[PDB]
Symmetry: D2
Subunit: 419 residues, 4 copies
């Protein structure tokens, strides 16, 4: 146990009384609205989102990085830190690794995971930066690089990622690359894409029967003129070309200004190519901010699309949900804890939507009541539900408060040497 | 007189009275546990007012088309009768903003009708973005900044007339928003056009009463699609500072570039005593003029957070003029203004809930997480019970839109007005 | 029949010839030193055409106001007389794109007038983004994707009629742009609306002749302000791939989110054989519909770089249905369309000056600098002489707008057409 | 000379022939337009833009940095490289320094500068990162940080920048900071700005009589929610508040999407607060790409505003221009050479605008001809002018070609050690 059980216990008790009042008040209110709060809590307590191994360390920009105390020394420290997130929120049972950063004996990763009660989610390849000994630089691209040998080196790396995942329990490989151009003319848009498709078809051949290959679009950064996998359109073209095992990943902050992201999710779902969602928030570009911190309503509107799919009865729909954020000015663990919470919060509120009444207002083109029906769920403070979900599953009524009372950060700060 | 039968208001309130009591008392207990007297909040909420635009009472359209609904108001007097409903039910819109020449009519009567309907008059709005019957000089290439002196003078005189009308009805401010700008590079000399504008505004200011305010309103684009004289708050500040003490800036939420941090702009203007007021509405792409809070409710709360904080910091003489400037193209105008007016009170109430002492503490300790969390604990709070109670205690409706539909008002005026 | 007197054209041409010969020869010498035969370029520029929107010759406005000029066309016939001017002076707009119901008239008359004016007819444009007098079902909440069956059916019926009118006048394609969408979250169900849109389009598709094409057009917003059924090229692609071989995509320059790489979209649609055509104009903030190349000439160039590159290589069946789609709110519509068309030919001609072999080499060497410099060398070249000589050789004007003004055509029709009032 | 003279001469002779042709042909066409090409060329060869000392190294992103061969390390390697740019384009006689990156003995800086034929431009302070052994961290800000000792440290540092500047010939201090917040509520907009203004006031006091203090706005990055100096509005309020010696810097890529940047330049000039413009290009955000490589017409429209002012010599308008770019996929030197070229190209084209005619069209509201009057100058290929200007002033006809012919890059790669190769 990363966090002393007696600490969690003391902290949960101190708030039990206040929780009981708010929850029961919310229960009565929901009952008046025809909603059984227990059924909502039952679903919330089982909603999981993956945590990125690389999100537990302090992030930075190209201008600087301001690390905090007790920064994780390697993958094992990161897993230890992810264990804290899961223990307190019970919403992040799985960890998503990034190779080569997390490269290590699979036997040992698995054992650490099992020992911590953590599982492993989608693997993540890295051909957007050069590693030591690398025979070919990824400066001008990787999977779509004009140099065949360079593309072969990227393919092999993705295949290795799969092998590693096969040994630890992972069932998918996420592929995000920087490939693109910074100057008009530097790249032949069409040929660069074909090279990419060619390299991806090879990675696809290495997929086990029950694995999936996720391609992730991004409007820009690191490329500032054009990007091979720039949007969901090109993303869909990829998944449809590769095969049943290939699907699209939608990362919130990877879209052009004012883009209607919730629609893209719907479109993808409609054609069964929504492989998963990468949560975070933003205001300007791919800011990778804590989910819900900037536009909480948009987060709820993304989930509205997710829940409506289930309501419509879409078949074999098990999206892979992962958090992909950067924490440049907060305790990484704390931001992940509250981000995971916002996600559960948006999900919970989406469950509160009266689809029946909604279905009616849409039919009569009653735009105002349709929107109001959505707002009634969104405006509901579901915090009590989230808190109760944690209590029942061994988590903390107030995760961050409990995290701070345990003095965890100071503990690891004294154990881990800064570099 | 009452546009909506008082027996309907009473009935539709008694039908919801029980539930409201339950919700209000629960919220009251919850705030008490948070050191907040719910009565202090309600008291301030029922005191918050925002003016309604006479032109918003009718159905709006785009350059592509206009799809009017039944019972469209024939003129200013019909529009006042519908504004009376908005006010009667929400009790948050005691004043109406007139637009000239659209609502030009015997001021003496307007006043009479206003007092009869329990309405007052807010800022006057001038119109030099369109030509009027008989007008001698077209505003096609501008108005106040037009290159032709005779044209600028005509625009000036029109604004002075606007002040004359407004003085007769009890108005205390003139709002100037023009489309002046260019659609082609080189079409206008930026500096000279602005100098022409300043000179004209100076003349209008000259004829402004000493108990009146002159509000200039910036906008990035439309109808001008390359450049706009008063394109942003920076230029707007220059205008206000230049003109004088009685001149201030008006911030319209949808008149800003993509991803602009509007709350910041609001704070800056307050700091330099130039925040004259607001034009509330929501948007996702451009100046969509959608119902407030329909797209980004958190942003609305943040704008209000700055207003409430300005008071907490001891800023003096701060009395912003709040106005709704929206276009309702696919809903009953009256129902939209009702809920928009409501969303604005909602954002105000949640902002009043912020624990400034605590927030201040986390800002000083650079505890970004708890700082944002402190803001969220207010925003997540469902303040609908306070809004409904406020309305109930002041002659309004627990559920405005519900009461509006139950009254059959729309069908009524549809039978009284042409098709 | 000549809308603009031949003597005036001849007069205004002879007045600039001396200067043109100098500039043309100087450029040719330069191009020659660059291993380029100027005559080969002029020959292709002469053959490049872009359709003119019948509604483009009338003064446009915004939701705030409309300030009409003098001599506004009363209907399709006046509009055709105005387009004839554009074609006579620029020689780059031989075909007009009609819009129903606005241009609803006897197909026999339309054709006769076009023939007499030396104009052909391009893609038909349907209208379900506004209600017509005597229309049974409003399009307020949608048309092809509307929740009410009768309303969709009515929309379907209308598009089929446009195909009929088109077959009679010589058209070979139907362009579909609708405002269908929502202004509020919840108002629409993204999936069910789209499904309805697909079903309806599948019907219109059945009424397409064997040599006709159906073009769907995406737009991020306006008139819908929260979500649009056909919001981007992604959805558009799904539409075209679902409908069939005769269904392609139209890319309207200003119908994209801020900072979108539009030229890549072109390339993407080309790569998958779904680039129905391009709708030119320029913009800075949104769907501004400004004169092409007036704001970002280089982007226009880059878009053509993709068009020419695709053309350069094995042109599968590549024959995009290009059309200008602009709104002229502060200029004489004819002069804007005249210069917009010239601008389009400018980007095209410069795209033809690109050293493809050299570009290909730098691309494979990942020589980003030289790659973008190779492109700039073409773009920087001032091709006005080629454009000017092209018009002259084909009975066009060396200085289109100058000739237009010198002819007095505007004052003329202004004297022949009823006055218009400004929209308040 | 970083580049041998025989190489420059040889590469110019090889292109002299065709240049005479193009130049003469352009001189004729301009003559027919009432424009004397010599007047234009004389002004172009005098148009300079400061080069950033950090612009010669390979740039990177938060995801990666892929250095090329012969990477300059330290202000001395850097100055050696900047000299290449100056010798070949003759458009960048001065270099802008960044402290602590280029911190070195002033005497040695002045020495190397005079030897390479380079002067020094505005000083650039750095409080958007922590230096080794720094008492207070700038994680949560610097000049507007909530902690007093932190602001004091930031102020003191900037003053240090002024001192270093007074000893090498610099006459200005540019101040761009990352200060802002990433979460609503994290910072109090007004109090953060007040602390900033109060700190800038202290720096301002340390300015000599002939020195200028430039503030630089930026919409976002590294702050992803709010930035204290987010736009020119706040910037103007800063310059106005600090005094006569304080002006605003406009960095092309530091604006919200679709912003009309040329208008901002005009407004600032009309009010005497435009301290200078930092050149680069962008398509998405602050991409810091090569000037005019994405939107050359926009670059021209900005210069159209600068040239209009330069013609009527506006009071308080003596801009300090500098290139501020990041080269991630090209040879920094080649990219800087060409960016400086694009900057001049735009300048030259703006100088071709018939101001009288334009003015007339604006008065009559003839938008078509007005925009066409700008296009005529813009559509003019002025490469012949820029090339002759370089040739007359000791530069190279084709800068990048000459540079490549000199094998300079390979040369410095042999002298400088790479991290691993
Ligand atoms: Cu990301
Ligand atoms: Cu991601
Ligand atoms: Cu507005
Ligand atoms: Cu407004
Ligand atoms: Cu359009
Ligand atoms: Cu179009
Ligand atoms: Cu800069
Ligand atoms: Cu920058």
């Amino acid at each position: 146990f990363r966090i002393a059980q007696d600490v969690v216990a003391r902290e949960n008790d101190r708030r039990a009384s206040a929780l009981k009042e708010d929850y029961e008040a919310l229960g009565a209110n929901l009952a008046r609205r025809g909603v059984d709060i227990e059924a909502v809590t039952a679903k919330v307590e089982k909603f999981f989102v993956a945590v990125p191994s690389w999100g537990v360390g302090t992030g930075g920009t190209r201008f600087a990085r301001f690390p905090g105390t007790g920064e994780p020394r390697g993958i094992f420290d990161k897993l230890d830190d992810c264990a804290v997130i899961q223990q307190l929120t019970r919403a992040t049972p799985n960890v998503s690794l990034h190779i080569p950063w997390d490269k290590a004996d699979p036997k040992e990763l698995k054992a650490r995971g099992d020992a911590l009660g953590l599982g492993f989610d989608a693997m993540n390849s890295n051909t957007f930066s050069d590693a030591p000994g690398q025979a070919h630089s990824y400066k001008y691209g990787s999977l779509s690089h004009t140099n065949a040998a360079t593309r072969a080196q990227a393919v092999e790396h993705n295949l290795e990622c799969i092998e590693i995942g096969k040994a630890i329990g992972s069932k998918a490989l996420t592929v995000w690359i920087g490939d693109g151009s910074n100057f008009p003319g530097q790249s032949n848009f069409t040929r660069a894409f074909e090279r990419y498709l060619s390299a991806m078809a090879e990675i696809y051949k290495g997929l086990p029967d029950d694995w999936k290959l996720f391609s992730e679009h991004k409007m820009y950064e690191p490329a500032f003129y054009s990007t091979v996998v720039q949007d969901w359109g090109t993303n869909y073209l990829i998944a449809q070309t590769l095969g049943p095992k290939a699907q699209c990943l939608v990362d919130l902050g990877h879209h052009a200004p004012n883009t209607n992201i919730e629609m893209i999710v719907a479109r993808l779902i409609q054609f069964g190519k929504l492989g998963g969602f990468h949560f975070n928030d933003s205001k300007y570009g791919d800011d990778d901010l804590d989910a819900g911190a900037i536009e909480p309503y948009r987060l709820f509107l993304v989930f509205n699309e997710l829940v409506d799919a289930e309501a419509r009865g879409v078949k074999g729909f098990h999206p892979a949900h992962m958090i992909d954020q950067s924490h440049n000015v907060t305790d990484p663990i704390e931001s992940l804890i509250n981000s995971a919470n916002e996600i559960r919060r948006a999900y919970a509120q989406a469950l509160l939507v009266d689809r029946a009444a909604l279905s009616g207002y849409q039919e009569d083109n009653d735009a105002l009541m349709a929107t109001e029906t959505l707002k009634r769920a969104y405006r509901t403070d579901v915090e009590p539900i989230l808190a109760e979900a944690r209590r029942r599953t061994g988590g903390a009524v107030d995760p961050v408060a409990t995290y701070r009372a345990s003095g965890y950060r100071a503990r690891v700060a004294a154990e881990r040497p800064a570099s």
